[PDB]
Write an enzyme that holds these catalytic residues in place. Structure first.
Site, PDB file in Angstrom:
ATOM      1  CG  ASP A 266      32.547 -10.256 -38.072  1.00 24.04           C
ATOM      2  OD1 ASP A 266      32.162  -9.236 -38.315  1.00 24.04           O
ATOM      3  OD2 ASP A 266      32.492 -10.948 -37.154  1.00 24.04           O
TER       4      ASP A 266
ATOM      5  CB  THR B  71      35.322  -4.074 -35.708  1.00 26.80           C
ATOM      6  OG1 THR B  71      36.543  -3.691 -36.744  1.00 26.80           O
ATOM      7  CG2 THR B  71      34.604  -5.052 -36.225  1.00 26.80           C
ATOM      8  CB  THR B  72      32.022  -3.583 -40.048  1.00 26.37           C
ATOM      9  OG1 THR B  72      31.521  -3.169 -41.141  1.00 26.37           O
ATOM     10  CG2 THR B  72      30.592  -3.828 -39.356  1.00 26.37           C
TER      11      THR B  72
ATOM     12  CG  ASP C 119      29.111 -12.307 -34.812  1.00 22.98           C
ATOM     13  OD1 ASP C 119      29.843 -12.188 -33.789  1.00 22.98           O
ATOM     14  OD2 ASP C 119      29.489 -12.341 -35.901  1.00 22.98           O
TER      15      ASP C 119
HETATM   16  N1  LIG Z   1      17.462  -5.700 -43.436  1.00 18.03           N
HETATM   17  C1  LIG Z   1      18.195  -4.726 -43.918  1.00 18.03           C
HETATM   18  N2  LIG Z   1      17.902  -4.117 -44.750  1.00 18.03           N
HETATM   19  C2  LIG Z   1      18.642  -2.796 -45.304  1.00 18.03           C
HETATM   20  N3  LIG Z   1      19.702  -2.577 -44.701  1.00 18.03           N
HETATM   21  C3  LIG Z   1      20.304  -3.479 -43.834  1.00 18.03           C
HETATM   22  C4  LIG Z   1      19.499  -4.448 -43.178  1.00 18.03           C
HETATM   23  N4  LIG Z   1      20.400  -4.894 -42.565  1.00 18.03           N
HETATM   24  C5  LIG Z   1      21.274  -4.113 -42.207  1.00 18.03           C
HETATM   25  N5  LIG Z   1      21.419  -3.316 -43.213  1.00 18.03           N
HETATM   26  C6  LIG Z   1      22.522  -2.294 -43.351  1.00 18.03           C
HETATM   27  O1  LIG Z   1      23.671  -2.726 -42.941  1.00 18.03           O
HETATM   28  C7  LIG Z   1      24.643  -1.953 -42.469  1.00 18.03           C
HETATM   29  C8  LIG Z   1      25.655  -2.508 -41.235  1.00 18.03           C
HETATM   30  O2  LIG Z   1      25.848  -3.867 -41.827  1.00 18.03           O
HETATM   31  P1  LIG Z   1      27.424  -4.326 -41.343  1.00 18.03           P
HETATM   32  O3  LIG Z   1      28.395  -3.603 -41.465  1.00 18.03           O
HETATM   33  O4  LIG Z   1      27.550  -6.000 -42.032  1.00 18.03           O
HETATM   34  O5  LIG Z   1      27.198  -4.647 -39.726  1.00 18.03           O
HETATM   35  P2  LIG Z   1      25.987  -5.408 -39.157  1.00 18.03           P
HETATM   36  O6  LIG Z   1      26.318  -6.898 -39.657  1.00 18.03           O
HETATM   37  O7  LIG Z   1      26.039  -5.200 -37.681  1.00 18.03           O
HETATM   38  O8  LIG Z   1      24.722  -5.157 -39.743  1.00 18.03           O
HETATM   39  C9  LIG Z   1      23.641  -0.937 -41.899  1.00 18.03           C
HETATM   40  O9  LIG Z   1      23.998   0.556 -41.914  1.00 18.03           O
HETATM   41  C10 LIG Z   1      22.582  -1.207 -42.356  1.00 18.03           C
HETATM   42  O10 LIG Z   1      21.972   0.183 -43.126  1.00 18.03           O
END
Ligand SMILES: Nc1ncnc2c1ncn2[C@@H]1O[C@H](COP(=O)(O)OP(=O)(O)O)[C@@H](O)[C@H]1O
Ligand SMILES: Nc1ncnc2c1ncn2[C@@H]1O[C@H](COP(=O)(O)OP(=O)(O)O)[C@@H](O)[C@H]1O
Ligand SMILES: Nc1ncnc2c1ncn2[C@@H]1O[C@H](COP(=O)(O)OP(=O)(O)O)[C@@H](O)[C@H]1O
Lengths: 516, 517, 516
Positions: free
Chosen positions: C48, C81-82, C382
């Site tokens: 995270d 935050t990311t 989460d």
């Molecule tokens: N199933 C998916 N396919 C492609 N890209 C994804 C998918 N799920 C999330 N993402 C990408 O991951 C990014 C955010 O990931 P992260 O920083 O780990 O936050 P979170 O855990 O809230 O998704 C987003 O910009 C999105 O484009």
């Protein structure tokens, strides 16, 4: 011995940036001059690009090689060595940034070639013709003098240059810059120029005050021994007996007497009055006892003549150079219309004009006895070169930074194709052409981005060639003031910049070897 | 780093620093003079005599500088010296003040083009307003006191003790030839040095004056043609030594008789060809003077390179240092050569004046050889100042009364035209306050009170600070009735050269590199 | 003491670039995990953003302050935050480049504010609504689990989460995440989850094997001293005589006998059969001699109960906690429908369900006895937070890097105004929004510019929201696969990025002072 990294490109970019930052404050008429002194304390003022690049001590070998390559391509057009390192440095910086971002030099080279082709097509399609007359050449010479010399004596030289060009050019074949002799003198004033329509002779006679209003005169060029020296000689080897050398001296004196009697009878035969004068040119000395007898009848004989003087005399008039003073055909005798004697300094000069086929103009200049006379000569030579370049073609495009903006707008907006790899190089090539107006605005004393966006808005709203004003910083049109340029100069500059930027990014590794 | 080789400290920051500090350090060793004061400086170079001078010309001619900014001003100084007579420190002071006042403008944040344009406009305005403060003028140059007053005023700048007798002598020597109207030469007046009494016994004499003795006879004829020679009495017969004590008397007597016959034939051939006198430049001998006395031939004794050089450049002869008797080829125009007795010394007098191109030679005498140099300098300065090539000199009240008026006029003119050109005009106006300050600081009092007093009286332009103690604090005097005036064209040329030098200095100012081998 | 330069901005840009380069490989589902160990050799696995930023040792004060500011803004939305330090670093680099070129931070701030307003307007105009059902929440939870846990057990977790959400949410007011208890156990397997619709009791009875099929049960919560200890006591102070303490012990035993007789008669009065059971919860011990007599009639009593257990029991059922065992009204007795006893490990657990108002769901999870159970708990938390955030609103915009491209295209092409000074900041703000797809394509295992220009060409040709594929690198539509996002999260991220980038360029000089 073993090196597999990318430090070569890094040091090349560093050397290019250093060379661009060293020479960048010599653009525009409001530039700063430079001085060079090292050998025996010789103060030499300069501001040109090739003259500076040819006489410098660069500690970097890459910068020296770049300067040599840039100077080797200066004998094509007039003056195009300046305003070239800036665009090359900008392109190299953009290429280094794109390499650090992650790309290949092949795509960059392809994009640069495509942008160069597009710029060449735009320049060929944007050209326009104009009738060559007197105002255009006057404005071109004035702009050249303003870019070379200060805005003071730039008005008395352009008129003389235009007059000399109009007097020399009268045929259809391209003119040649080999019949115009630029001489120099030593005076007390500064602004002193003269345009002589005849030839100039440095030496004259040892016994002056006799006559100077000789109309139709006959000139004969020879090289016989009239009076070299009164010392006894033989055959280049000293002897012991004096009778032989005194007899040789007596025979030489008798031969000189026979020759002067022959030329006297020739002058009496071909003339016989005071209106038809005669002038003789000889490189040897002249005895005063014989010079008096010669002048008593009405024929002037000059002594101590240079080779170039007699060469120009026999090339402009057309006479045969013989080694005898016999009675021959008067076909080799050249005609002279007006002869004048100018008395100034420690030697009197001779001016001959009103001759047949006036194809010899002299641009006499004077200085305050210093080293600025060479600078004035270089400036007038650059002006003559620009005038000759502006007379061979019939198309003149405006300048003042009004061509790079349109080129960048055509390369950015109206893209020739749709490709991201090509656009990655097209944008870098278009962003490197806006350094000239920024440098001009910085050297003029204003801002850099305000004037840029003002010119951009003026070009986007109107659509005409907007120039850069060096007075108030306001966008104006350079097509109505008088600022002009050339045609092949821009093409040669673009070709040189592309050739330089192409054969640089392909450098792999630099090893330490070699013996010769 | 890329161009230089760790030799000079030039770059993009030394302009507003070193180019001004060099000129400031060069001018700081000059403000100590400029005015009637006793600030003598010793000069030690190659003569090894330890002599003190006061003028800046000899000081600058001996100092060796290794800077282009300092060498850019000596050229203008030499040009001003070749043009008019005086005028040297004024250009340097003006350039230093202009640079010191432009340093602040460059440090504030202004381009050099605007400063150059403002300086040119101020110089043009000053040149236009200059022909407006003409008070006195030259009437008749045939009088004595009319030029004597100007000569005294010109000499008072150098010597302060004695200045009336020298001025009167210079006036009498100049009025005995030709005035300024028509044609007047400068290289026709010579100065001779006589080691005898003091300077309170000098006189004047027309014609050539040379300190040369005579061991022959007085030849007052017109057929005595001159014959200059290098070293005729050197040694045509070289004699060596055979033994240690003495040789045979027969060979010595034969050699002596042969040499005597040879020299007799030589003098006979040189006297029968049309030359009664002969100019020798070697040693003497008993038989030589005997033959010169028995043949009625004038023989000299003192020899000098300057004397023969002057005789060659005046007459037009050529010395023939040959062994065999040559031919007479040194015919000149002199004929009347007389002898005179001055100070128990024999002098020659040449008479060949036909009311055109007359010459004169003033007789000078002093204690030692280290005191006549200043007298000769004052004499030549007065001679050069007398030449103006105009009937009306149009003298202006110099000494600083016109500089304040010009500065006030420039200040009043600059407060009219708007724009960014008022700072340069104000600087050019304030730079004119460097002449009264240097004159007040080299006396004994301050300069701020003097400037305040000069600016508080009135704008008449005829008020200046005096030299006595009763004229330092008030500084209220009328120099129009005293007789203190200056040259009109000299100040104009000085201002023009100073402006040109300042423009050249402010123009060429970037990076000073080097030249390849 | 005295400092007047621009080194502060330089070191700030350097620290920002370092912080951006340190944390940049944790974006997307195909990210690399990290580890942290320092305290007595405790291996901790996390991935995270806030958890890592909260437990690290930074040697730079500026980076520490930036991390603190970023962590102080995570309590608003779910997880934002990311994917925030990259855009801030890009904007700071662009601002530093524009400052080195020659500009003022005020114009940059104005352009950044204008670009933020334009992006907010574009996001408000591009939003779309969608009917909330079961497939949308399932896909949202699956994506939230894939972005945290591996693609192995991301099925039984999201199914249980959706089931618990559907069982809890049934009203119109916003739900609360305080009625769901997440417990943990110790087993041998890895994938082991359970969704209990009742309460969980850790402790049970000391004498098992009696009965477990108790349907209708009455539960009563109290806190009287039934059997604390057999040791003799008094009033917290030791004495010397034994008669007083033995009489006190006898009186306590008589009181315990009276209390057990009273509860026996109460059970006999309120029941009398074997169907209606009576369960008693007490935190004190229970004597076996009395427990046998109690179980002989059909009433069970538990010992050693926690405070949270009785709190949840009295909050879900609704009973009064008294300090007496007298015959009172049976209104405070809670009803239980089904009671089960699970025997596993060293302590038997009790599961009570089929009660009134089922508003207590337990998500039991078992792990292989390590530290990954905490990671699974954080991942499911989460996921629950994302589900709660996706249920409060009714508008969900697609993601997968399909909002930044349209935003940049709208900010570059359709300019709100015509101004070079504003464009100088608009271009910098638009060029920093493309840091997500490039980093995603780099981490996926493909190129960076090829996929970018491919997506650009696809969006220019078609015009729909084109996403990024993490399998073949081909441009695809994210509106038909199942990739979704939120609404207020993007707005909060943009606001935080603008606030951080605004209050950084205004730093003048940093002096060394202070004492506190
Ligand atoms: N199933 C998916 N396919 C492609 N890209 C994804 C998918 N799920 C999330 N993402 C990408 O991951 C990014 C955010 O990931 P992260 O920083 O780990 O936050 P979170 O855990 O809230 O998704 C987003 O910009 C999105 O484009
Ligand atoms: N009269 C003018 N007004 C404005 N700009 C000018 C003028 N003349 C020349 N320039 C500018 O000077 C630049 C070239 O100057 P320079 O490098 O000295 O070469 P040149 O001496 O051949 O002009 C051109 O880009 C042009 O824009
Ligand atoms: N007796 C004097 N009274 C007033 N001013 C004088 C006197 N002597 C010299 N000056 C002033 O001193 C200045 C410098 O004179 P001088 O030394 O002759 O010229 P320079 O300084 O150029 O060599 C002159 O401008 C003159 O006005």
């Amino acid at each position: 011995e073993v090196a597999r990294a990318q430090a070569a490109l890094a040091v090349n970019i560093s050397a290019a940036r250093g060379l661009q930052d060293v020479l960048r404050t010599n653009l525009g008429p409001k530039g700063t001059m430079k001085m060079l002194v090292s050998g025996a304390g010789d103060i030499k003022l300069t501001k040109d690009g090739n003259v500076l690049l040819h006489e410098m001590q660069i500690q970097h070998p890459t910068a020296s090689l770049i300067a040599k390559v840039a100077t080797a391509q200066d004998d094509i057009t007039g003056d195009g060595t300046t305003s070239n390192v800036l665009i090359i440095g900008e392109l190299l910086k953009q290429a280094d940034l794109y390499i650090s971002e992650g790309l290949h030099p092949r795509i960059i080279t392809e994009g640069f070639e495509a942008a160069k082709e597009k710029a060449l097509q735009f320049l060929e399609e944007v050209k326009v013709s104009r009738e060559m007359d007197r105002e255009t050449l006057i404005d071109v010479a004035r702009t050249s003098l303003r870019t070379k010399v200060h805005a003071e004596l730039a008005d008395v030289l352009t008129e003389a240059v235009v007059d000399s060009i109009l007097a020399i050019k009268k045929q259809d074949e391209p003119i040649d810059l080999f019949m115009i002799e630029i001489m120099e003198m030593k005076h007390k004033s500064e602004t002193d120029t003269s345009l002589i329509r005849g030839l100039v002779l440095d030496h004259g006679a040892r016994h002056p005050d006799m006559k100077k209003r000789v109309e139709d005169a006959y000139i004969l060029t020879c090289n016989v021994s009239l009076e070299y020296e009164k010392t006894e000689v033989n055959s280049g080897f000293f002897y012991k007996s004096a009778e032989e050398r005194e007899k040789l001296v007596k025979a030489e004196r008798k031969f000189i007497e026979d020759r002067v009697k022959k030329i006297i009878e020739l002058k009496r035969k071909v003339c016989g009055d005071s209106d038809k004068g005669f002038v003789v040119i000889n490189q040897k000395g002249i005895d005063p006892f014989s010079l008096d007898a010669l002048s008593k009848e009405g024929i002037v004989a000059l002594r101590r003549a240079k080779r170039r003087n007699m060469e120009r005399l026999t090339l402009a008039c057309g006479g045969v150079a013989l080694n005898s003073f016999d009675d021959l055909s008067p076909d080799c005798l050249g005609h002279a219309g007006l002869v004048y004697e100018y008395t100034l300094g420690e030697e009197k000069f001779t001016f001959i004009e009103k001759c047949n086929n006036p194809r010899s103009v002299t641009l006499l200049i004077k200085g305050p006895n210093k080293h600025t006379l060479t600078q004035i000569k270089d400036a007038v030579r650059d002006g003559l070169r620009a005038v000759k370049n502006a007379i061979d073609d019939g198309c003149v495009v405006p300048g003042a930074g009004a061509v790079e903006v349109a080129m960048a707008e055509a390369l950015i907006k109206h893209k020739p194709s749709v490709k991201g790899r090509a656009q990655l190089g097209v944008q870098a090539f278009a962003d490197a052409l806006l350094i000239i107006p920024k440098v001009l605005a910085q050297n003029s004393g204003f801002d850099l981005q305000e004037t840029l966006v003002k010119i951009q808005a003026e070009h986007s709203e109107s659509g005409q060639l907007v120039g850069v004003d060096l007075n108030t910083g306001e966008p104006m049109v350079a097509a109505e003031v008088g600022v002009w340029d050339n045609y092949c100069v821009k093409k040669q500059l673009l070709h040189s910049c592309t050739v330089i930027a192409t054969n640089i990014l392909l450098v792999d590794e630099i090893m330490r070897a070699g013996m010769s | 780093m890329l161009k230089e080789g760790a030799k000079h400290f030039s770059g993009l920051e030394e302009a507003v620093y070193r180019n001004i500090q060099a000129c400031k350090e060069l001018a700081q060793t000059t403000r100590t003079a400029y005015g009637p004061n006793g600030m003598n400086k010793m000069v030690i170079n190659h003569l090894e005599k330890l002599f003190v001078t006061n003028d800046a010309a000899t000081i600058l001619r001996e100092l060796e500088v290794q800077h282009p900014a300092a060498k850019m001003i000596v050229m203008a100084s030499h040009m001003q010296e070749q043009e008019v007579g005086d005028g040297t420190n004024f250009v340097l002071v003006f350039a230093g003040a202009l640079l010191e006042l432009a340093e602040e403008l460059l440090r504030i944040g202004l381009s050099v083009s605007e400063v150059i344009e403002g300086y040119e406009i101020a110089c043009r305005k000053a040149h236009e307003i200059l022909p407006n403060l003409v008070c006195c003028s030259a009437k008749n140059l045939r009088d004595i006191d009319e030029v004597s007053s100007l000569l005294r005023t010109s000499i008072m700048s150098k010597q302060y003790g004695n200045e009336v007798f020298l001025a009167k002598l210079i006036a009498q020597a100049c009025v005995s030839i030709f005035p300024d109207s028509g044609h007047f030469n400068v290289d026709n007046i010579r100065v001779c040095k006589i080691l005898g009494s003091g300077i309170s016994s000098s006189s004047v004499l027309h014609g050539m004056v040379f300190k040369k003795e005579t061991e022959g006879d007085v030849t007052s004829v017109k057929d005595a043609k001159i014959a200059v020679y290098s070293c005729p009495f050197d040694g045509m017969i070289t004699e060596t030594k055979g033994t240690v004590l003495i040789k045979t008397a027969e060979e010595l007597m034969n050699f002596s008789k042969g040499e005597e016959n040879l020299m007799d034939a030589q003098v006979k051939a040189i006297a029968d060809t049309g030359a009664n006198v002969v100019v020798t430049g070697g040693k003497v001998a008993d038989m030589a003077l005997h033959y010169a006395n028995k043949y009625n031939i004038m023989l000299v004794r003192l020899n000098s390179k300057w004397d023969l050089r002057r005789l060659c450049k005046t007459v037009g002869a050529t010395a023939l240092p040959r062994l065999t008797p040559p031919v007479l080829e040194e015919m000149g125009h002199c004929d009347s050569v007389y002898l005179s007795e001055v100070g128990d010394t024999q002098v020659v007098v040449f008479k060949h004046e036909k009311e055109d191109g007359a010459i004169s030679t003033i007789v000078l005498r002093g204690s030692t050889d280290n005191l006549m140099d200043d007298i000769e300098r004052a004499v030549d300065d007065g001679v050069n100042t007398f030449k103006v090539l105009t009937r009306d000199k149009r003298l202006v009240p110099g000494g600083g009364a016109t500089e304040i008026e010009l500065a006030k006029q420039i200040t009043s003119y600059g407060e009219t035209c708007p724009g960014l050109e008022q700072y340069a005009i104000k600087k050019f106006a304030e730079a004119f306050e460097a002449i009264p300050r240097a004159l007040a600081e080299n006396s004994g009092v301050k300069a701020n009170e003097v400037i305040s007093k000069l600016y508080a009286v009135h704008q008449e332009g005829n008020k200046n600070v005096g030299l006595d103690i009763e004229a330092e604090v008030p500084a209220v005097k009328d120099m129009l009735e005293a007789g203190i005036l200056d040259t009109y064209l000299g100040k104009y040329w000085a201002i023009k050269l100073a402006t040109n030098a300042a423009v050249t200095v402010l123009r060429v100012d970037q990076i000073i590199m080097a030249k390849p081998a």
